[PDB]
Design a protein around this nucleic acid. Structure first.
Lengths: 99, 108, 94, 80, 99, 80, 107, 94
DNA sequence: ATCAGGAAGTTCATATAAAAGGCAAACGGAAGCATTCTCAGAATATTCTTTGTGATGATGGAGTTTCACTCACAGAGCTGAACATGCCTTTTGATGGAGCAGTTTCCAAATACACTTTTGGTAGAATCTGCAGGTGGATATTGAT
DNA sequence: ATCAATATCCACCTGCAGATTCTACCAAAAGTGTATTTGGAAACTGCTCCATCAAAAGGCATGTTCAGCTCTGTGAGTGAAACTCCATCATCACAAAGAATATTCTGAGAATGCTTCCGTTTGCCTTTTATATGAACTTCCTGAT
């Protein structure tokens, strides 16, 4: 016997505000990608830039899954496949879509 | 001589936003060469109206959420539950705002 | 330390004439402080462009009126125009 | 262990639940890691350009906000 | 015995540059929708504005059907339904989508 | 006969063939007329606003081009 | 007496007018004062992008056996090219048409 | 008739050295004219906000460089920067 | 593996609309000199970002079962493209015409400018309170009879 | 249709983080004359959009059929959520520390202002050419065999 709890997890995550990616595995990913653009020079990051970029890199992904799950429900499925996300990034376009 | 005392031109128009500061920002921001004297008066009234438009709905959401002080989620709800503020603040993400509590009806 | 001016004491006065028993936190003060700086440069950038398309050198009240009417959507640019007009017609009668 | 493997499985699941997703395929944990990398590569490049023009070595919050603002992703709360 | 002609029609239309809606049935639709905003006053249009607005209104519809037909092929269909256009105008957003 | 009924069935069919549509449902011919009216309402409103600010009664080509430019639909070919 | 006049376009070796770019940066109200290297930089960048698009459009005209570039050829040249499609992304080119692209399932 | 000046005689000079045996029609000259007037108003607007974020009064070549590097994508920017640096070096020499 | 017949590509001639070319004028870009003034540079305080290092409990990684879900397939029934036929909305074009926008002069009221004085807004203190976590009872699901 | 467990909701206590309130003071906003200039107003012209009429034919509206679909249901098999557990990793505190950002004063090279003069750019007739169009030929591609 196993009860469903996806319905109790979506509701407790839609009424909270806090960030859902842990702070340090994002805080070294951003400093890794920042190396390739400064020609090996390590820039310093402020403590309010690694939050003001995580607040946008999660508000992109949550809205991306909200716009791809409409495509998943459109095809008769319920399971979210990568061919849904790759389509929802194409319909949005060059600007709003990729990147 | 008998130099008369100052009336602020926020008070000559009855606003709450600073017409002097808005005039200086329109003059220093390089939007045009001359700035007419009715333009900061018009623009400060428009900004006061939109600020009251959002803080009223945010206060109603804070009252519905059994609280006193307005937090950023009480602005997220106030903006996204409204058809003409969601259209204005459309491509705007509001930090610590959360999302609307949406579940698709076919799942339930 | 530089002076660092803002709209923080004016958003508070507009809050405490529509909800006299309600406070506002620091981060929701910052969000309402960034909202005003956004709509300010949005309306001023539209009215800098109306008065450059038409070969003018002055941002009058009429450019701010039609820039409000371009930017603000629907039944909100019907109230904001009246809120600005009833401020200009009582500024000039003083 | 690459650093993009720090965007773990339950964090992607936890973002998709806030997005409202009932069931999640297992192949999406690489598509999401490949979309997040492209979003960060487009925002970090413009933040670094705004830093280098100002002759600094510190990436403030204003640089990130100006990078997000010009891609049509205006961020409120950090100074605008 | 009948034959197909849709594949000959798609190919002969995608290599053309001319306009597909006739000129006068659009030149009176635009002048009717103008009356709802001018308070009964009849504005004049130029002849270069009723082409400048038609060039935009058809490059909107062609790209809308290209974005909706991906949704049609996505659900396993071939036939373009209205529930595809109504979703391609939802994923695009508030600006690029509706209107 | 109404004016929106002048956007006929061969016109919507022939725009759909340019978009690449193979078979076209019978209910789409009112959905396309519903979308076209919403687009024309959003564009002619700003065309008339830019006209009225300049004190004219003739909507020139630059006013429609400026109405399209500020919605993110930059039109090349009519002066700009 | 004065010396012979030399244009800044021919001094920098460009083709676009550095004088007109300087006048349109002063009369446009972008900032208070305008330096002397900014129009020389900006005219060079504008000449480069125009020389890019007029070469892809020339190739698309030559591949269609025509010696004059029509807006169809600019539509083709911009949309077939990966980064000019990303620059001119939200741009409609009038009398331009679409790219020939039939979905491969339908064939 | 007014002045009505544009870029039509400069786009043609660029065409006569990227393809010496190829003319261009009138509407496809108006499109290149509109393209130049759009890229100009884009680069100069980004340079004007760069000069205004840092409290400068001057748009030098450095703001145009860091506005090309923000607008133009990919290899197109890294070619345009080296196309402009060559021209301002040749200008400051002669 | 074999023919039929329209579809599409070749190719040469030809009008003709459209692009290239020549010539004047006005206007604006350049040379030159006098003047201001912004900003790169040097010296200095001070803020705040990084790295370590330890403590530690919070949470993700790994593996195994079970059942809701995706996918291919077949068959019934709807429906959309194809075809025949007439006829009616588009289109050209054509001149009259008259509402209208672009041009030119003049001047007056609104806008800047410079100086002095008051005054409100920000920064830095002391001080008061909303709320988040905690503890514990009433009540609205979720089975399983 | 009914009893236990449980998840939800709520009633209340309080520590403290954070909002509120209280003060020097400084920049800046406002009042007062001065001077200059932008743009609303009127006259006028020449451009240009609306309206109408005849026609003419081409494209659209309507009916009918049939074959290519959409939809629903079924069953096989795949695969994702639930569950346990513990050890790895992120969080926090913190003393310092030290690079790098922010502030301040200086003068010089770069930018502007003004005058003159001359060379570029655009506008309007004039030719000359590329491209649409026609018309027959030839291939060739698709349905049939």
């Amino acid at each position: 016997r196993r009860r469903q709890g996806w319905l109790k997890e979506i509701r407790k995550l839609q009424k909270s505000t806090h960030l859902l990616i842990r702070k340090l595995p994002f805080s070294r990913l951003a400093r890794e990608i920042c190396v390739k653009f400064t020609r090996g020079v390590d820039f310093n990051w402020q403590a309010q830039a690694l939050l003001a970029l995580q607040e946008a890199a999660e508000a992109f992904l949550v809205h991306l899954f909200e716009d791809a799950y409409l495509l998943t429900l459109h095809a008769g499925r319920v399971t979210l496949f990568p061919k849904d996300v790759q389509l929802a990034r194409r319909i949005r376009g060059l600007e709003e879509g990729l990147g | 001589k008998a130099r008369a005392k100052a009336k602020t031109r926020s008070s000559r128009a009855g606003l709450q936003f600073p017409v002097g500061r808005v005039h200086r920002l329109l003059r220093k921001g390089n939007y045009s060469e001359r700035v007419g004297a009715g333009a900061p008066v018009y623009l400060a009234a428009v900004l006061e109206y939109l600020t009251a438009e959002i803080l009223e709905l945010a206060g109603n959401a804070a009252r519905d959420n059994k609280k006193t002080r307005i937090i950023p989620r009480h602005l997220q709800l106030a903006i996204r539950n409204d058809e003409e503020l969601n259209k204005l603040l459309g491509r705007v993400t509001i930090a610590q705002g959360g999302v609307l509590p949406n579940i698709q009806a076919v799942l339930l | 330390r530089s002076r660092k001016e803002s709209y923080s004491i004016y958003v508070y006065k507009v809050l405490k004439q529509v909800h006299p028993d309600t406070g506002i936190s620091s981060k929701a003060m910052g969000i309402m402080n960034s909202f005003v700086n956004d709509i300010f440069e949005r309306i001023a950038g539209e009215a800098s462009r109306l008065a450059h398309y038409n070969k003018r050198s002055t941002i009058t009240s009429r450019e701010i009126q039609t820039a409000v009417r371009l930017l603000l959507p629907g039944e909100l640019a019907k109230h904001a125009v009246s809120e600005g007009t009833k401020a200009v017609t009582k500024y000039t009668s003083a | 262990r690459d650093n993009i493997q720090g965007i773990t499985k339950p964090a992607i699941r936890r973002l998709a639940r806030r997005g409202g997703v009932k069931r999640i395929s297992g192949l999406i944990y690489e598509e999401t890691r490949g979309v997040l990398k492209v979003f960060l590569e487009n925002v970090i490049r413009d933040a670094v350009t705004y830093t280098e023009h100002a002759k600094r070595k510190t990436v403030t919050a204003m640089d990130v906000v100006y990078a997000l603002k010009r891609q049509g992703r205006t961020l409120y709360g950090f100074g605008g």
